[PDB]
């Protein structure tokens, strides 16, 4: 309904109705529209009989309350421990879709994901933003996977370092490049010596940064995306690679809370606060290839795999 650019007002209202059903339940967006259309098609002959729309509305409210009563009476309670009931609910939801021959694979995943991102004893709802979905072309739908760790489409900047075991990971919200004050800054040269000095002191600044990074035991480095300043200069990449550190830049400022929730990292915005307690320990971090259909960074295994 959202994709067919409906034009009649009532049809637009049915579109909004299906969206509201998608919000409140996420399932039933076709049943709700069909029920609405049918109730209105019956209102047709009611109006013809000569009943007032207000009487129709009130009687419909009565029928709605009685029907909620009836459905609740039909209903049976469920324990979230009833994994078979959860599997059957998911399979029923999937029977209608093109992925129904794969229900045997995608129902247990759809139950595991939700049961991994909620405390089953206290939870009263679920935030499906805790469940990240990554669409990658290639393979078949039988290749869908449930990754308990973290997955990133951002590419690795180091050449030769694609796999890291016993990975210590750090989030860097500061820029690894020549210093730049937030104010207008220049470096005025008036002697030839100051030129060599400028290049050398820049090298030394960058090297001190990467050394403070290495000293913590960090071997995987996630750098936030930075416009207005180079977040990862070639000097910094050279030094990180020489120090055997995997580097993934261009991380987005909206994936930060997710990455932290996932791999226990704490985002660092000043090198002074970049220490070992601000890292995340992961049993593996690898850039995996998908049969020539692209690459993915998989951070699997976690000492603090928090509800993601």
């Amino acid at each position: 309904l959202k994709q067919m650019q409906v034009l009649h007002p009532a049809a637009r209202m049915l579109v909004e109705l299906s969206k509201a059903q998608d919000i409140e339940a996420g399932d039933g967006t076709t049943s709700v529209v069909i029920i609405a259309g049918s109730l209105l098609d019956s209102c047709t002959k009611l109006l013809q009989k000569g009943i007032h729309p207000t009487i129709i509305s009130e009687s419909f409210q009565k029928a709605l309350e009685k029907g909620i009563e009836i459905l609740t009476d039909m209903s049976r309670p469920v324990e979230l421990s009833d994994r078979e009931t959860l599997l059957n609910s998911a399979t029923t939801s999937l029977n209608s879709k093109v992925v129904s021959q794969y229900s045997s694979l995608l129902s247990p995943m759809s139950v595991n994901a939700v049961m991994k991102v909620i405390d089953p004893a206290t939870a009263t709802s679920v935030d499906l933003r805790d469940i990240k979905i990554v669409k990658k072309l290639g393979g078949t739908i039988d290749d869908c996977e449930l990754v308990e760790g973290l997955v990133l489409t951002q590419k690795v900047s180091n050449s030769g370092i694609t796999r890291v075991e016993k990975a210590k990971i750090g989030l860097i919200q500061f820029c690894l490049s020549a210093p730049k004050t937030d104010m207008d800054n220049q470096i005025v040269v008036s002697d030839y010596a100051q030129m060599d000095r400028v290049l050398r002191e820049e090298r030394a600044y960058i090297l001190n940064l990467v050394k403070q990074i290495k000293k913590t035991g960090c071997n995987v480095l996630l750098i936030q995306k930075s416009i207005l300043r180079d977040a990862l200069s070639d000097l910094a990449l050279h030094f990180l690679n020489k120090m055997k550190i995997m580097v993934i830049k261009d991380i987005e400022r909206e994936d930060i809370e997710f990455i932290c929730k996932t791999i226990g990292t704490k985002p660092v915005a000043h090198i002074d606060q970049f220490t070992a307690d601000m890292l995340g320990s992961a049993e593996l971090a690898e850039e995996v290839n998908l049969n020539g259909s692209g690459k993915l960074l998989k951070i699997t295994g976690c000492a603090s795999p928090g509800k993601t």
């Binding site: 098609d41 013809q48 009989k49 000569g50 009943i51």
Partner: protein
């Protein structure tokens, strides 16, 4: 909506039908629903023109002339329809008018209702042919139930009250209900004067329905004779002739003339004088032959010239000329005279008799009409309609046509069902009972047929301001409780629901034809599942 959409599995042109790109096509359930939508639109247009409290429609033609009417057949004929199912509904109303002359709006409303119910049945998934067959079953049940609950009226010329009641029921819904009983009386007397009781036939050519603006609707009357839009040939002839012996002639009062190519040659002064005397003597001989027959009036079909006109005036023979063939025929039939092709063949026995022949004026107009009446046993008749405008005159003409057709239908079959939706409610009850006893899947179609039959009482109630469902349910419950298929909708609010007491009366052939025609056309419409057109 397209004839062919492939263009080939190989890229080569695929042209199968001419102008397939400009042509359209609708197939299947969407075609059925389009049909139902068109029919429902037509029927919902018409249902407000149903019953005494029904309102009229103002039709404007191509040239801008206005027609105000309540007649469903006239409405759908004047209606500029493009949809083929609406054209079928126009044909349906026209068919009801041809066969019956009444019901032209009921048929359309009922057919629309049947299709509206078939819509829900198709939604539930029933085959449209199964729907049509259930409709046929229910229609047979309803027709037999009409034959069962029908009543009979006397079609005699002594007591004409039942026929007057039937005609009044017919004219209740028309603008001429201001002169309700006068119009009913003149329709009854018209058909009974011109009706073959033994043959059970009524030739409407023997009923001349004439209208003239001016006067009042109350001035409309039945002339037992003929009216003509002509006057006496000479302005000094008398305008009134009593006990008129009439010579009806189709020979122009002119010198004879062969039909074959002829050349009369004059070759001498004697030939010229002989020709002159021949012409004079022809005129004198024509007038003398008409006089010796004993006629006091002549009526020619082909006009005549100055000598003949003045000789008629001189010989005291008032005369009408340029009278049309149909009115000449009616005058012969009415006055008891025989149409004569030439003067030599005219005799005192071939003459007609009218106790009064008069020329009538119409105020400040210069227009004259000729009335021929006081005949002995006129088997022809004229209805002269007056009124304040040509719109109400034309509406009065068609309304009186409805009344005449109803009296005709009584003469053909005197059986009578009671109206006000009572017959429809009773047929709906009978169809519901038989659907209850039916175990096949057509139960649903028959229930739909009953719910459709119940649309006429609902429409009457709505047009009368009553609540449709409330009124219909109360009268249905009363019908089943106290067995009285004459219980219907009190459109005029006389208190009683008894249509047999209110004298609301329909013809059994009328209701049966409504049901049969509606069902047959609904069947042909449900049988269509593919439309093609440019």
């Amino acid at each position: 909506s397209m004839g062919t959409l492939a263009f080939d599995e190989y890229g080569r042109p695929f042209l199968i039908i001419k102008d397939q790109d400009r042509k359209s096509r609708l197939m299947g359930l969407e075609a059925l629903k389009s049909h139902i939508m068109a029919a429902k639109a037509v029927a919902n247009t018409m249902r407000t023109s149903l019953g005494p409290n029904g309102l009229d429609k103002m039709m404007v033609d191509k040239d801008g002339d206005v027609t105000v009417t309540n007649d469903g057949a006239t409405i759908l004929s004047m209606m500029d329809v493009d949809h083929q199912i609406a054209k079928l509904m126009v044909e349906l109303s026209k068919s009801q008018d041809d066969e019956i002359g009444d019901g032209t709006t009921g048929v359309v409303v009922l057919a629309g209702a049947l299709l509206e119910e078939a819509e829900q049945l198709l939604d539930r998934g029933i085959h449209p042919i199964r729907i049509a067959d259930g409709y046929e079953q229910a229609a047979r049940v309803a027709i037999e139930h009409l034959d069962k609950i029908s009543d009979s009226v006397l079609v005699d010329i002594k007591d004409t009250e039942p026929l007057i009641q039937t005609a009044k029921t017919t004219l209740g819904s028309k603008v001429v209900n201001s002169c309700h009983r006068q119009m009913a009386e003149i329709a009854v007397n018209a058909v009974l004067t011109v009706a073959d009781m033994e043959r059970r036939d009524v030739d409407f050519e023997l009923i001349k329905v004439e209208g003239k603006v001016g006067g009042r609707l109350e001035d409309t009357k039945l002339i037992k004779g003929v009216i003509v839009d002509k006057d006496f040939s000479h302005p000094q002839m008398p305008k009134k002739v009593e006990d008129a012996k009439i010579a009806i002639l189709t020979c122009p009062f002119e010198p004879p003339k062969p039909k074959t190519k002829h050349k009369l040659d004059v070759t001498s002064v004697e030939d010229y004088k002989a020709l002159q005397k021949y012409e004079k003597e022809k005129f004198e001989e024509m007038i003398q032959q008409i006089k010796e027959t004993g006629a006091n009036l002549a009526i020619c079909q082909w006009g005549f010239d100055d000598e003949a006109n003045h000789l008629l005036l001189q010989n005291n023979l008032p005369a009408v000329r340029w009278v049309g063939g149909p009115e000449i025929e009616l005058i012969a039939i009415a006055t008891g005279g025989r149409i004569v092709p030439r003067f030599s063949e005219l005799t005192a026995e071939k003459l007609g008799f009218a106790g009064l022949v008069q020329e009538i004026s119409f105020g400040t107009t210069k227009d004259k009409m000729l009335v021929i009446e006081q005949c002995k046993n006129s088997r022809a008749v004229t209805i002269f309609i007056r009124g304040g405008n040509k719109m109400i005159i034309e509406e009065a003409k068609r309304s009186l046509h409805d009344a005449l057709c109803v009296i005709r239908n009584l003469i053909r079959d005197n059986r009578v069902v009671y109206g006000g939706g009572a017959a429809e409610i009773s047929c709906a009850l009978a169809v519901s009972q038989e659907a209850d006893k039916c175990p096949t899947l057509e139960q649903y179609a028959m229930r739909a047929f009953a719910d459709a039959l119940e649309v006429i009482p609902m429409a009457l109630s709505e047009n009368s301001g009553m609540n449709p469902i409330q009124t219909m349910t109360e009268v249905r419950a009363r019908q089943v409780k106290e067995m009285n298929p004459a219980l219907g909708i009190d459109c005029l609010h006389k208190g009683t629901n008894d249509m047999k007491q209110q004298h609301v009366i329909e013809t059994l052939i009328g209701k049966k034809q409504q049901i049969s025609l509606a069902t047959q056309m609904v069947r042909m419409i449900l049988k269509i599942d593919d439309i093609r057109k440019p």
